[PDB]
Amino acid sequence: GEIEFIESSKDAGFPVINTPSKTKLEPSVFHQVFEGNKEPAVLRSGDPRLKANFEEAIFSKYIGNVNTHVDEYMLEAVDHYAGQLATLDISTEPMKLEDAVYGTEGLEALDLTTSAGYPYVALGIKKRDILSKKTKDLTKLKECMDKYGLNLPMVTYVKDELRSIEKVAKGKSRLIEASSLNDSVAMRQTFGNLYKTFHLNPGVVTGSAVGCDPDLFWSKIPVMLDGHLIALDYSGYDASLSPVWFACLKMILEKLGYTHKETNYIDYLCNSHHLYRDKHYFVRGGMPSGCSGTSIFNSMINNIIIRTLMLKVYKGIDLDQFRMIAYGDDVIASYPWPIDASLLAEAGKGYGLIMTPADKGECFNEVTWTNVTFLKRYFRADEQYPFLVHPVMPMKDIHESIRWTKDPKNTQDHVRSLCLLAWHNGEHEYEEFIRKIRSVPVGRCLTLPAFSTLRRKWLDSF
Ligand code: NA
Ligand code: NA
Ligand code: NA
Ligand code: NA
Questions:
Q1: Which residues make up the binding site for Mg(2+) 1?
Q2: Which run of H or of E encompasses 144?
């Protein structure tokens, strides 16, 4: 993706978007009990911790575009992945408005907590001023959609989240680019059934893990992924995507039965208009990170990409023996023969992607079930039930998380969430975690599940 045009918002009649510039993240009561190095991301230019220019840093992800046509390798990659999806009988019929907004099986209700986007944010109008869970009212919404229409600017916010020392210093904060409510709803109507099919079928047919529950899904992955693992990392995947990858996505959507008109929404993602504070800008390429379907579309594109690279480097490849699951940029894949990921990564560079084998800069030279991660988690087969696989979030990441809070009123929910991750590290690890939590008075005021209970509930869930 490439920023094509930027100017002061006022020159175009847009008011300044008044976004949060101070973090909601504060040190929790566990800040001193546990060790950590992470701190809230930089949210504003004047942050004293900056060792770089902030505005340049946050937009540095837009590395440019490769300007090329959909080539023979992409065409065959699209054909192959499209043939997999055809198995699922995805309906291209619009999802009815009530299902698309207030929840149906496979597609949770639209989040009332997130930004309603433009123009609502400039009018002080919130999602709850328009929608109502209790009523399932669509009257105000139909009104707003008629009045303001579709294809509105996306509002860019800086993500308020913990970051490493390096990322704070370099100012590499992430951006969330929020689709207008109108566009969110329209896209959920148009693609809602696709969304639903993907959510209900994580695995190697959708090639997707979006919506998965690692507690259950981790046991299925090694069954699905037969051979030698491939686990390339990307740097700045979303923003690196050039328009040709969006063209590939449109082709696959058309193969599934969507009309050219219904694929128009992909153009809204690719060639996008953003408002950031006092500025507005147009981007060519790049998946906006915060519109409807961004994770699913990112995953579909990753499925096309990896196939393309393998087809391009390994001319004798048999994609019918290839398996992959993606969650956005994150990929775990296998093939029955060793594949040189460094060759794939270099082929990727030719398509404007910045990729590195998972073993690069690590102490090992082969990706295995011992060292592979997916969704930040390791894989560890249970000692007693070897066919069951624990998703293993590093205790370090759990400790980083517990040391801060955006609101201490949620301490019980936050800490319980972390316990559900922590226990997979083993009974000893978990008991020490509990002890330290309980070493602050708040910790003894919390309902914390016992190790035996967590393990018993996990076993029974299968
Ligand atoms: Na874009
Ligand atoms: Na990964
Ligand atoms: Na390899
Ligand atoms: Na290495």
A1: 233, 329
A2: helix 139-148
Which of these, 375, 341, 241, 310, lies nearest to 81 by C-alpha position? 310
The binding site comprises 233, 329
Q: What does the alpha-carbon distance between residue 174 and residue 157 come to, in Å, rounded to a whole number? A: 9
Tell me the CA–centroid distance for residue 350 and ligand 1, in Å: 20
State the alpha helices, DSSP H only, in 235-356: 237-240, 243-255, 264-270, 294-313, 341-350
Ligand minimally distant from the alpha carbon of residue 325: 2
Residue 181 alpha carbon to ligand 4 centre in Å = 45
Q: How far is the CA of 242 from the centre of ligand 1 (A)?
A: 9
CB proximity list for 410: less than 8 A, separation 6 or greater? none
Q: How was this structure determined?
A: X-ray
What separation in Å is there between the alpha carbon of 202 and the centre of ligand 2? 16
d(C-alpha 462, C-alpha 457), whole Å: 9
Q: Which ligand is nearest to the CA of 341?
A: 3
35, 265 contact by CB (below 8 A): no
> For the chain, how many helices (H) and strands (E)?
19, 16
Ligand in closest contact with the CA of 232: 2
Ligand closest to CA 230: 3
Question: Residue 68 CB: number of other CB atoms within 10 A?
Answer: 14
- Ordered domains of the chain (ranges, CATH): 1-13+70-202+243-285 (no CATH), 213-242+293-368 (3.30.70.270), 376-462 (1.20.960.20)
User: How far is CA 138 from its chain centroid?
Assistant: 29
Helix 139-148 × helix 181-200 angle, to 10°:
120
CA of 166 to the centre of ligand 1 (A): 27
**Which ligand has an atom closest to residue 240 CA?**
1
- Measured in angstroms, the resolution is 1.8
Distance 377 CA to ligand 4 centre (A): 19
3-state secondary structure of 454: helix
Q: State how beta strands 39-40 and 162-163 pair.
A: antiparallel
Distance 315 CA to ligand 4 centre (A): 27
